Design a protein around this nucleic acid. Structure first.
Length: 474
DNA sequence: AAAAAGACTTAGAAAAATTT
DNA sequence: AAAAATCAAGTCTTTT
């Protein structure tokens, strides 16, 4: 069970499409064309993106073009046969204009809309779970638009349709007032499932996956999980030595399965690589994790730049972000890696005979609740605490001790390979480091938590900012 | 077994909020 | 005052 009582207002639907001005026109092969409202709409999605890299990719253009046609009238399909002949510039300029006519709004104008938001937020921004009012994260349905898959996503540019109330499944307690859909519509369904944390859900058309509207990080339901997550990583702190010794000997198992997984658990542990689940062949971008690594992703070098037994990783992790690195590994592992490459083609799997189900299944037998990801959290958390104790000058000053924090904080962002656009510290600070670690340190050094965590971070980590003191040790 | 379906974490980018 | 700086894609759990 996740809650005994649950009441809410339901999702906020996307604004209906507002038709283009008569003065704003579309040109095809030099001629003007009053596009049907549905074909006009899709075209606008494209227009508002003409200033974006997405419109230069040939996958986007083809996906967009194909999907656009599926909306045109039988006549537009006869005429508009070449994207290269479509002129979205006038249209493009109108929205660009609109944006500026927004950057350039009067204070009275701005104030008016700020308050139009405040009413939406105060109305659909909260729900009642059990006895308290909680904050809802994504209370508005994702608007129709073109798919922005990261990387070489083969589905980028595909149309993301408008979600009707008839696609929405509502979740709330049996004793709750069911949120009424917009007048003249019905919800897809209304369930009273108290084993789940979502309030709303609908199936997304491009992948065919379920989308949910869930609570806020500061919600109980979210915070409790977070607390638990670090606990689980703390328990690993206790048996990692047992665990590291055990796989370290599995490197010599007379069974390759056992070795493939021990080398994998090795990388995951030492390098913080993600489990690496399998992605549908030709339906997602080609990114890989530890398990899914292919032969072509690593290069071994008996000696490299002086170093000996160097495995060179070069691949695109999650979000097609590149993970490049030269790692000096232990001989036995280096050799196993060669054993695993024999008779394989570049496109072959390094760790054939091994997967995340197998790996985690194993991990669980070793410690209840242990999974690949737990290593990352643990490694990150243990890293930050070790560094906060090593770089924090005793007689330094708040600002410099804050720089100290930042340096300790960045050592972690490097481990996980967090890159904004480079080294992004936000995610580790919000997702992998036990808040109690910073809370303690702050309290110990007299550095105000407000100096490190901002108000929201404090809302989120509130549980930690109260239950952890100057004696906290992960 | 293994895919599909389902539920929730994690992630970077894009939108929104001190100095001349 | 005006302008310049500072909301897809994994993992892991369940269900032909």
């Amino acid at each position: 069970i996740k809650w005994k009582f649950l009441e809410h207002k339901g999702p906020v639907f996307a604004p209906p499409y507002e038709p283009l001005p008569e003065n704003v026109k579309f040109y095809y092969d030099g001629k003007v064309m009053k596009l049907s409202p549905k074909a006009e709409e899709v075209a606008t999605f494209f227009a508002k993106m003409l200033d974006h890299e997405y419109t230069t990719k040939e996958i986007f253009r083809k996906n967009f073009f194909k999907d656009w046609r599926k909306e045109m009238t039988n006549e537009e399909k006869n005429i508009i046969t070449n994207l290269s002949k479509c002129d979205f510039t006038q249209m493009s300029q109108y929205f660009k204009a609109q944006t500026e006519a927004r950057k350039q709004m009067s204070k009275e104008e701005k104030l008016k809309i700020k308050e139009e938001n405040e009413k939406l937020l105060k109305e659909y921004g909260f729900c009642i779970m059990d006895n308290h009012k909680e904050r809802i994260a994504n209370f508005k349905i994702e608007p129709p638009g073109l798919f922005r898959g990261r990387g070489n996503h083969p589905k980028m540019g595909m149309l993301k349709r408008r979600i009707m109330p008839e696609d929405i499944i509502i979740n709330c307690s049996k004793d709750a007032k069911v949120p009424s859909p917009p007048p003249g519509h019905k919800w897809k369904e209304v369930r009273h499932d108290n084993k789940v944390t979502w309030l709303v859900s609908w199936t997304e058309n491009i992948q065919g996956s379920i989308k949910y509207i869930m609570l806020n990080p500061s919600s109980r339901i979210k915070g409790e999980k977070d607390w638990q997550k670090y606990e689980t990583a703390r328990r690993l702190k206790k048996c990692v030595d047992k665990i590291r010794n055990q796989y370290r000997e599995d490197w010599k198992s007379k069974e390759m399965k056992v070795r493939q997984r021990a080398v994998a658990l090795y990388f995951i542990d030492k390098l913080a690589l993600r489990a690496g689940n399998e992605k549908e062949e030709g339906e997602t971008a080609d990114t890989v994790g530890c398990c899914s690594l292919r032969v072509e992703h690593i290069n071994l070098h008996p000696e490299l730049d002086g170093q000996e037994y160097v495995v060179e990783f070069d691949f695109l992790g999650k979000d097609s972000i590149r993970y490049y690195n030269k790692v000096p590994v232990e001989k036995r592992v280096f050799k196993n890696l060669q054993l695993f490459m024999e008779n394989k083609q570049p496109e072959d799997d390094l760790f054939d005979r091994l997967n995340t189900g197998i790996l985690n299944k194993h991990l669980q037998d070793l410690m209840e609740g242990l999974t690949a990801k737990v290593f990352r959290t643990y490694n990150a958390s243990i890293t930050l605490q070790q560094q906060l104790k090593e770089l924090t000058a005793p007689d330094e000053n708040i600002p410099a001790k804050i720089l100290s924090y930042n340096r300790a904080n960045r050592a972690v962002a490097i481990l996980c390979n967090h890159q904004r656009a480079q080294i992004a510290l936000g995610t580790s600070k919000l997702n992998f480091l036990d808040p109690r670690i910073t809370v303690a340190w702050c309290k110990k050094w007299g550095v105000p938590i407000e100096k490190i965590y901002n108000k929201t971070q404090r809302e989120k980590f509130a549980w930690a900012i109260d239950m952890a003191d100057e004696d906290y040790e992960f």
